[PDB]
Design a protein around this nucleic acid. Sequence first.
RNA 1: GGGAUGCUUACUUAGUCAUCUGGUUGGCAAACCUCCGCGGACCUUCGGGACCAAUGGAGAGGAACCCAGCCGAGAAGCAUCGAGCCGGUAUACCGGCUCUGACACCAACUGUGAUAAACUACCGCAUUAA
RNA 2: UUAAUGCGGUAGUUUAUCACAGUU
Length: 638
Amino acid sequence: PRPRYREERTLVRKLLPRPGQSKQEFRENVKKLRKAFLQFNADVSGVCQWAIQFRPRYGKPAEPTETFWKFFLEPETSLPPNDSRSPEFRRLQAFEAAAGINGAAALDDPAFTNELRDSILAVASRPKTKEAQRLFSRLKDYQPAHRMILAKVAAEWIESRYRRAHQNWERNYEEWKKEKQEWEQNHPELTPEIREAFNQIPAARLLQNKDNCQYAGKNKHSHTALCKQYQQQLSHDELYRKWRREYWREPRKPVFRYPSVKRHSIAKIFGENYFQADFKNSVVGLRLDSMPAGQYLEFAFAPWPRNYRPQPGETEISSVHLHFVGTRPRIGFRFRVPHKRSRFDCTQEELDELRSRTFPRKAQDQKFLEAARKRLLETFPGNAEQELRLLAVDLGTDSARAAFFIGKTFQQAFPLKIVKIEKLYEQWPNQKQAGDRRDASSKQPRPGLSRDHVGRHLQKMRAQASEIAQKRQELTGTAKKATLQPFDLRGLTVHTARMIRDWARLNARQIIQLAEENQVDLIVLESLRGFRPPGYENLDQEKKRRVAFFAHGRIRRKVTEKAVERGMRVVTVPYLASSKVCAECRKKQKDNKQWEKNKKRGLFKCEGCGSQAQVDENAARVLGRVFWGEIELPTAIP
RNA sequence: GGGAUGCUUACUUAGUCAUCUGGUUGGCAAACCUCCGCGGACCUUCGGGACCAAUGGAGAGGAACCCAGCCGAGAAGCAUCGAGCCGGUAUACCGGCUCUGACACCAACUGUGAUAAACUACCGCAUUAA
RNA sequence: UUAAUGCGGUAGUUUAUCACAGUU
Ligand SMILES: [Zn+2]
C-alpha cells in the first residue's frame, strides 16, 4: 500500500578539504557547520516538547486540542487532494497559529475545517514547557523557508515514533483488554483472583515458579528468588502455570524520545534553492541557512563513481541529505532512478501485508506458504507452473549457488565469487584436512573479510579500549557510577562497520548480476538465527567489536530494493530446515553433524536419496521446491 | 598488479582488500570532554527509569577524543626510458593511442520488541587456605 | 570474617538477532 519502493539508491560521499583553500580555515568551515548543525537539532527537539501533550488520551474524554494533533501529524488524509501550496505548508500555519510564532495569525484558511479552526484556538490557551517559550522567540529569527523545513521535519519526528506507536498501542491495549477480560472467565480453574496474588509476590523464573521448591537445586547448581516465591505460594506449580501466562503486566505505553546528536540527528533536507552539485570538479555547494541569499560554500568531495549504474548526467539531484558521523560532514545526493516493470499483476507490498499482519505468528507459517504460493499464480500472465523462473539464495559460508527452476525441473546450479582477496576467488584457499566430532584447530589469518580477519581488528581494540576505560576512571572516575562511553573509539569501528556492510553489498551485488542473464521471476530467502560465532572468544568489556556479524537480515533489504529496480521479485519464507532436508526426497536428516563436516568442503551426502551434490545445490533446490507444493515446512516446533 | 622511474603538493593515509584503518610525535590556540541544570518531559511497579535542554557556564587529559606535525604509503599537473597496436616516409625514423591491483562506491540512517553470548557491579550456594 | 574460583540471578554497557514502521 505505501510507496516504499521509491526512486532511491541515493549517492553519498565523504567530505574532502579543497587542495587550495587552507588547512585551518577548512576546520573553521566545519565548525561553521557545527555551530548551526547543533542549533537545528536543538531547535527541532524543543518543538516536539510542546506538541506531545496534544496526544489522544484513549480512556479520557476527547479534549478539544486532540483534533489539531491529528491534522498537524497526518494532514494528507484530513485535507482536500487539491492543496494549493503543499501539505506540509498547511501544517506549518497550524503549528504557527497554535504556537506564538504566527505574527499574522492566518489560521483562517479555506482548507482548514471547523474541527481544526477551534482546536488551534484551544491549543493556544494552554501553558508551554518554558523551553519552547524561549525557542519560539528564537524561531522567529529564521527565514520562513527555514521554518518551512524545520516545522515539517519536527512533525515527522512525532509522526512515526509516537503517534503510530501510540495508536498501535491502543489496538494492543484493546487486544490485551479483550484477551485479559476473556481470560478471567475462560481460565477460572485456579486463577479467578489468585493471578493477582502472584503479582504481589524469564526462562529461569518460569522453571522455578512451576515447582514445589525442588527445582531450587537446579537454580543454584546450574534464579533462587523465583523458587522461594513458588515455595511461599504453596504455604504452587498448579497456580503458577496459569498466572505467568496471564500477561498481567500493563502494555508498554509510548515513552517519547527526543532528537539528539548522538543516536539520531536527522539528515537536514537542503531542498529547492538550497543545494548545488559539481562532479567535473568534485566540489559541493553546501550552503547553511545563515546565508539569506544562498551563498553556497564550496567544499571538495569524492567524485561520482565511474561504475555506478545511473550516471550523473541522466538524473537530477533534489536535495542534499547531510549528517555528522564522527567529525566528517557526510552528505547525501537524493535523486530519481528509472525502475523496471515486473511480469505480474501484484506487488511485493501485497506479500508484505500477508507476512506482517495476516501471518505474523510462527504457528501460522505453513498457511502463509499456500496463501502466498497461490497468490502469484493468477497474477502470472502465462503459466507459472511452466514459465516461472526461480533462483533460491542460500547465503553460504564459502560457496553459494542458486538453483535454476522453471517448471519444477532442475537444470543446473552455479556458484558466486563471494569472497574478498586481492583477486576474487570462489573459495578460501583451505585444503588442510577434514575431521569429525572430535576436535578442531586452525590458526591462520586469511587476508580479506574472513571470520579470522575480522576478528584480528577486534583484538587490537582490546588494547585501546581497556586503556581508555582504565585511564578514564583514573583522570576523573577515581565503581558502579559508569562503565564507558560511545565516543571512545569510532575510527576502526566504522572501518569494520563498513567492512561487513560492504561484504553484504558484495553478496547483494553478485546475486543481482547473477540473476540478470536469466530473467528470474521469483527469488526465495530463508531466516536463520545462528548458532555460535567463533569471532569473539577472549575479548570482553567493550562496545566496539561485535560489528563483525554477517547481517543476514540486512541482505534481504538490499535485494528488495534492487529487485524492483531491475524488475525482479524476492520473497522471504519462515525458518524451515532447508539444509537438513534433501532436495529430491523428504527424508529430514536428523544427524545435524555429518552435514556440517560436508558443509566445510561445500558438498554433502544424502542419507535417504544418496545424491552427492553440493550443499548450495541442496539448500537452493529445496527452497525452490518449498515454493511449490512438493516440500513444505516441517512444523515440528511443538 | 604488467612497465619502470623522478619532479611538484594549504592532497589523501577515516570505501574495503592487497602481510596493511602503516607507524610515530605534540597540542598555545581550538575542538573534544567531565560534572553540573533556566527548565521541562513521557511512562511508572509512584521507588524510579530514559531523553531533550539555555545564542550557558566552566575545567582537562594529550589514555581516548579532536587539532596539528614527522616518516612512508597512494592520487594527480608534468617529465624520462621501454614495449604493444598502427600508418606516412625508409631496411629505419616521426607521431598518436592504452599504458598502472581488485572490489564496492551505501537500502542508508533510525527506533521499539526478543534470542544466545560477553564482561563490569553485587549477593549467595558447591569446591579450595586461617 | 580475609584469599583462589565456578555457577545462578539482577542492573550498568552492549552487539547482532527477528519483526514492524518512518525521513528518504
Ligand atoms: Zn530427503
